[PDB]
Design a protein around this ligand. Structure first.
Ligand code: 896
Ligand code: CA
Ligand code: NA
Lengths: 10, 252, 28
């Protein structure tokens, strides 16, 4: 359900 | 938010989503009070009866959002947490007294049309605005019903409730560090925060200086939008010496 | 300094759809 966020933040 | 409405774009530019890194899920609301500080409820981070005890690397904050679930490219900003500060006297065993926490971001967030800090009340603000009948605004991406989930940030305006009514509505012990808000059954109007809205701001627009102040933080409730029940909010001004203590000691 | 002043509302002198309801509750 949540769109994936960019890599940079994980 | 139960029985609210969709927010307008940029209506709550201090709104923050606390996002669990994995599994990816909304944890809580929060608010932006400066370029590096976010305010939330302690129970969003620490509540042992539910096996909740988050640390900095477990979460992210998402700022500037409107959509609940999308990654709002070129609008939202995602920040890492440097450090969490929970009120040392947060009473999770009984009634969530002093339900407040600060989060310092690793880097400053750039303000924009969608990202801007809310003011915190001083003594006079609180005296002027924290009065029964006066309405504030609660926002969040929590559940739409006690028993779906919204596509976009929800908002509801709710009146501050007289303290004896708050007290008489619950068996939980109320403290001076809390207030309650919501409509009474005879008032016909509805609305409450709900699961997912914890930690978000209760804001009021001062008619003296045109500025929005965060008077409360979404704290505890028994159910959501139940008749004769009220939501409880952490009284921000009553905890302001602590807020200031933390920011002065650890701020940049 | 500019806390609490929204770029898309107070800074442009635009009002949101329900802030009047709040104002009307602030009786003094
Ligand atoms: C009654 C006992 N408690 C809770 O059940 C409780 C414990 C926690 C950790 C959260 C909570 O309510 C969360 C809920 C989302 N908060 C609301 C606030 C305003 N309106 C509805 C819900 C309720 C506390 C200790 C008083
Ligand atoms: Ca009681
Ligand atoms: Na109610």
């Amino acid at each position: 359900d949540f769109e994936e966020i960019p890599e940079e933040y994980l | 938010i139960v029985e609210g409405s969709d927010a307008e774009i940029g209506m709550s530019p201090w709104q923050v989503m606390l996002f669990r890194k994995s599994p990816q899920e909304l944890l809580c609301g929060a608010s932006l009070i400066s370029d590096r500080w976010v305010l939330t409820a302690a129970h969003c981070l620490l509540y042992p009866p539910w096996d909740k005890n988050f640390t900095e690397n477990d979460l992210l904050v998402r700022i500037g959002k409107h959509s609940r679930t999308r990654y709002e490219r070129n609008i939202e900003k995602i920040s890492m947490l440097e450090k969490i500060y929970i009120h040392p006297r947060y009473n999770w065993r009984e009634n969530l007294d002093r339900d407040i926490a600060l989060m310092k971001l690793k880097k400053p967030v750039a303000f924009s049309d969608y990202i801007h800090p809310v003011c915190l009340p001083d003594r006079e603000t609180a005296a002027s605005l924290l009065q029964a009948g006066y309405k504030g605004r609660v926002t969040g991406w929590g559940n739409l019903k006690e028993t779906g989930q919204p596509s976009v940030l929800q908002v509801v305006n709710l009146p501050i409730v007289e303290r004896p009514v708050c007290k008489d509505s619950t068996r939980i012990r109320i403290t001076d560090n809390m207030f309650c808000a919501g409509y009474k059954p005879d008032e016909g109007k509805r609305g409450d925060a709900c699961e997912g809205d914890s930690g978000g701001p209760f804001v009021m627009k001062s008619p003296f200086n045109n500025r929005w102040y965060q008077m409360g933080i979404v704290s505890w409730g028994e159910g959501c939008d139940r008749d004769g029940k009220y939501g409880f909010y952490t009284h921000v001004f009553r905890l302001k010496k602590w807020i200031q203590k933390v920011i002065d000691q650890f701020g940049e | 300094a500019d806390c609490g002043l929204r770029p898309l509302f107070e800074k442009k002198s635009l009002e949101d759809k329900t802030e009047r309801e709040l104002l009307e509750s602030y009786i003094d």
